[PDB]
Amino acid sequence: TSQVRQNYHQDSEKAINRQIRLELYASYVYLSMSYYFDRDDVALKNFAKYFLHQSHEEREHAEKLMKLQNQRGGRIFLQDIQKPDKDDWESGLRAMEKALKLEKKVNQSLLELHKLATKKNDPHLCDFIETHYLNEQVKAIKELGDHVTNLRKMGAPRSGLAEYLFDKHTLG
Amino acid sequence: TSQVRQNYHQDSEKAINRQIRLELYASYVYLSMSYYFDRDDVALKNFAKYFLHQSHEEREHAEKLMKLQNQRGGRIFLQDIQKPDKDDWESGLRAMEKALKLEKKVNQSLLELHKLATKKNDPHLCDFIETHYLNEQVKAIKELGDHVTNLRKMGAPRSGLAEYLFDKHTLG
Amino acid sequence: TSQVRQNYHQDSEKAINRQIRLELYASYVYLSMSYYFDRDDVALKNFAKYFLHQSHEEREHAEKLMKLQNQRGGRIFLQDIQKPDKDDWESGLRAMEKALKLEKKVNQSLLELHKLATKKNDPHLCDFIETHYLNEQVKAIKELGDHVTNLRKMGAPRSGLAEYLFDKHTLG
Amino acid sequence: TSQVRQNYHQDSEKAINRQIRLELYASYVYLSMSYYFDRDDVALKNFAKYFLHQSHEEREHAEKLMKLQNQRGGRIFLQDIQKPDKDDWESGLRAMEKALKLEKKVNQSLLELHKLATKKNDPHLCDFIETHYLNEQVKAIKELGDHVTNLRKMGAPRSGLAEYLFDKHTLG
Amino acid sequence: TSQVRQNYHQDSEKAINRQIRLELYASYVYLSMSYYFDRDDVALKNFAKYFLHQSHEEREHAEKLMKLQNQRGGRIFLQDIQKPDKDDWESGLRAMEKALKLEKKVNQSLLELHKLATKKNDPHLCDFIETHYLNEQVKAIKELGDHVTNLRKMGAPRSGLAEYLFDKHTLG
Amino acid sequence: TSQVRQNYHQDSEKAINRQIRLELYASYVYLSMSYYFDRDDVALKNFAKYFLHQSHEEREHAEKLMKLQNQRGGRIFLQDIQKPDKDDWESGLRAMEKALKLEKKVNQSLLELHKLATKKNDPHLCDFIETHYLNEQVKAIKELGDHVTNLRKMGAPRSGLAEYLFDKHTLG
Ligand SMILES: [Fe+3]
Ligand SMILES: [Fe+3]
Ligand SMILES: [Fe+3]
Ligand SMILES: [Fe+3]
Ligand SMILES: [Fe+3]
Ligand SMILES: [Fe+3]
Ligand SMILES: [Mg+2]
Ligand SMILES: [Mg+2]
Ligand SMILES: [Mg+2]
Ligand SMILES: [Mg+2]
Ligand SMILES: [Mg+2]
Ligand SMILES: [Mg+2]
Ligand SMILES: [Mg+2]
Numbered sequence A, B, C, D, E, F: 001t002s003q004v005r006q007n008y009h010q011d012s013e014k015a016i017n018r019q020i021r022l023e024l025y026a027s028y029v030y031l032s033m034s035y036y037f038d039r040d041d042v043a044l045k046n047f048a049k050y051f052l053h054q055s056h057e058e059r060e061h062a063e064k065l066m067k068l069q070n071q072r073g074g075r076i077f078l079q080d081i082q083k084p085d086k087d088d089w090e091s092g093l094r095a096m097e098k099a100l101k102l103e104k105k106v107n108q109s110l111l112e113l114h115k116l117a118t119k120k121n122d123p124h125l126c127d128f129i130e131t132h133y134l135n136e137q138v139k140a141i142k143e144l145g146d147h148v149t150n151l152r153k154m155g156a157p158r159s160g161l162a163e164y165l166f167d168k169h170t171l172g
Helices: A010-037 A045-072 A092-119 A123-154 A160-169 B010-037 B045-072 B092-119 B123-154 B160-169 C010-037 C045-071 C092-119 C123-153 C160-169 D010-037 D045-072 D092-119 D123-154 D160-169 E010-037 E045-072 E092-119 E123-154 E160-169 F010-037 F045-072 F092-119 F123-154 F160-169
Strands: none
Touching: A010 A045, A010 A092, A010 B045, A045 A092, A045 A123, A045 A160, A045 B010, A045 B045, A092 A123, A092 A160, A123 A160, A160 C123, A160 C160, B010 B045, B010 B092, B045 B092, B045 B123, B045 B160, B045 C123, B092 B123, B092 B160, B092 E123, B123 B160, B123 C092, B123 C123, B123 E045, B123 E123, B123 F160, B160 F160, C010 C045, C010 C092, C010 D045, C045 C092, C045 C123, C045 C160, C045 D010, C045 D045, C045 E123, C092 C123, C092 C160, C123 C160, C123 E092, C123 E123, D010 D045, D010 D092, D045 D092, D045 D123, D045 D160, D092 D123, D092 D160, D123 D160, D160 E123, D160 E160, E010 E045, E010 E092, E010 F045, E045 E092, E045 E123, E045 E160, E045 F010, E045 F045, E092 E123, E092 E160, E123 E160, F010 F045, F010 F092, F045 F092, F045 F123, F045 F160, F092 F123, F092 F160, F123 F160
């Protein structure tokens, strides 16, 4: 047992490792999306920037969990980071929709982790999740919803005009 | 066939995708190393900062290869990123030795990529590898060797004093 | 033989004069395109500015090759600069498509020039081409492809709205 | 007929196209001259700079004419730009004498264009030529005459010392 | 074998040692030339400064090769630095001519080294030579040629006036 | 006989030339030492910086003697500069001991030069040696002794820790 460990259940430790993995996966999905918009045959530079920024943010999310794991005297164990589910993300709209789905999946995981932390009477871990993750998820999901809504209302994905103008005026 | 594609062999395109995967793997190994050093029972904060920096550098290396693939009109295909070979890196000295081994494996891959680009008379690709990668590897390898040497001569990994003082005076 | 000449094949020397001519020709093509967009019946001022910038860049590319010819002790022989293929470039999208084609033609010549320098074991000339020309071409080709893509997806050149908006938001 | 066209004779329009070609030609002559003085066996760097500056000015003279043609609703038609009459310009003195002859030839063209504009009662074209071109030509011709006179009086082009000191003290 | 060594042929190692020696020799030749112009019976202070500057640059060239040797895990072996071939360099012109000959000899050596690096499939070493040495040689040879040409055209070496004025206006 | 020459014995002139050679030799020994410390299997960057500084200082010492020779109207005759006695300097301690031995050998030579200048009643030369050399040697010798002493008392060359810590704390 680590000399620092106190009130940290092994199940919470193991779940924090799985969340680190999910954060690294979300980073990889966004990196994929970013470079999809960087293709010469897609060429939406502000979509590309947006998703790259998101990819770097997910890596910070992962790193803060790894720090947490050591702060609590848990031990990080890493697994493969699986490739994202698509290579071609189809359109600005379709990528935003997949991102929305991803953020809701990461949120579900965080809510299940918080439910475990509660059952294990770990208020430090509860506060960690609430403070650093849960409102970040709500804000992300809201933003992505707003983006989907505007793209759909503008006529996307069939209107390439819509996606060009959203790139410039919302993401730019 | 992409409208931008010119003098870019399918074999080179595939080789760039393998290289992207390896850069992302290298990022992952360093991220693992960094947080090993952040454990309470290891506690070498500058080893931790050093390897986190390397992790971020390797992500940049991957991103630049992704940019190149699109510049040349190739198509990015991402794969699962393999977990690192170790979960526990044993000591500062042993981490730096493994890092040296990693950078030589990445260099070898880049040298093989260059031989391929040479065979396919792709001077743009040769220059990209030279300009952005090959000297970066030579400097990384030499620095890691220098660190290994100092750690050994100081008495590591036997001397916890040695790793402490190297962490302060070299990596701090 | 010039007192400075060393390792500089006569065939290279002649190839360099042909390249000078082609860079001057590309400057003239871009000049022509620029002033087409300045017509009152076309009136896309950022297309005009974009192509004038490209014309001046190609003049600089020619001058750098002239400097190189003298650096190596070759002798410059200039020839008539041929008029561009068109007077009327039809639309923004069609001009961008013609420019892409021109940049791939220029790139092909440079690659043939590099092949010759490699066959003649002239690494100074290889480096000159790589350092100053090949990646400039790859960047210009990628930019033009991105531009063509955007204009297409916006609905050009049928859509005089698409070219107006691209002029403002991308080239502005 | 262009919607902007007013009081602009077809003969003047064609005369403007002829002037554009001649200004481009003059740009090319000066370009050739500049890089002759850059040769290792000539090596007069300020002669080289002086004629490059002149070459760029002539390009601006061409561009301003292209702008004028579109301002008036004429249509630009570009032609082959003929190579200069010499490859080797012999000396600083002899290049200055040929430049003097060039600027007088250009001035004669502009005077004929002015006569035409006068005959066609085109006061806007008369003023354009007077304002932007005729005194620029009188200034250029006086300077080149001054320079030839100094070179002669110093003992060029047989005195390599004369050209060296003129390069330093006048063109520097 | 050094722990850092990778893809570094022993023949390339040995050739880099010989180049270090040639760079140190070029430094010594320029030091000799410098102080020749510092003699009371020659007294051209700007020739003296010129060649001293060149002497210090050659030492930097040597040092960067020694750094390269260690970066690659080669081992520096030094030999005597032979005295330059003259004690009295005769004139400004004659020294510039000997310097030109020296720079062409150093360039030949670098081109032979690059040919060895190519045959040994060492693209790092190729890039090192191209990036840091080959254009430095071309520029040096061109400058020295230009200097010889002007001195000859001015009347040197028989005109001490020529050498005095070149000292002041070109080298000063 | 130089027009400036006064009270300057032929024996002193020859002795100054021997001294120039020895200063250049000292520069070369330090350059060797510096890059021994830059090897990956030695890796003491501040020992490397220290000895490179000394190398540059000794080149300045040589240059000032060359200036003196010309000031007094003597004639510089340069000789082959002997390679240093060692290729491998073994350790920080052993390098500093060899450096101490070198500086005493250079001092001895300067003291012999001074005895000669005294015998020949050349007070200018006596003052030059005193002013510019003798105290510089006494300070160099004392500093090197101080370094040797510290390295020995710390446990070098046995303790790689000792040389590490001296490199950081004294030479850094
Ligand atoms: Fe996240
Ligand atoms: Fe990398
Ligand atoms: Fe070009
Ligand atoms: Fe003009
Ligand atoms: Fe050199
Ligand atoms: Fe000294
Ligand atoms: Mg709270
Ligand atoms: Mg190459
Ligand atoms: Mg361009
Ligand atoms: Mg002019
Ligand atoms: Mg009037
Ligand atoms: Mg290169
Ligand atoms: Mg006294």
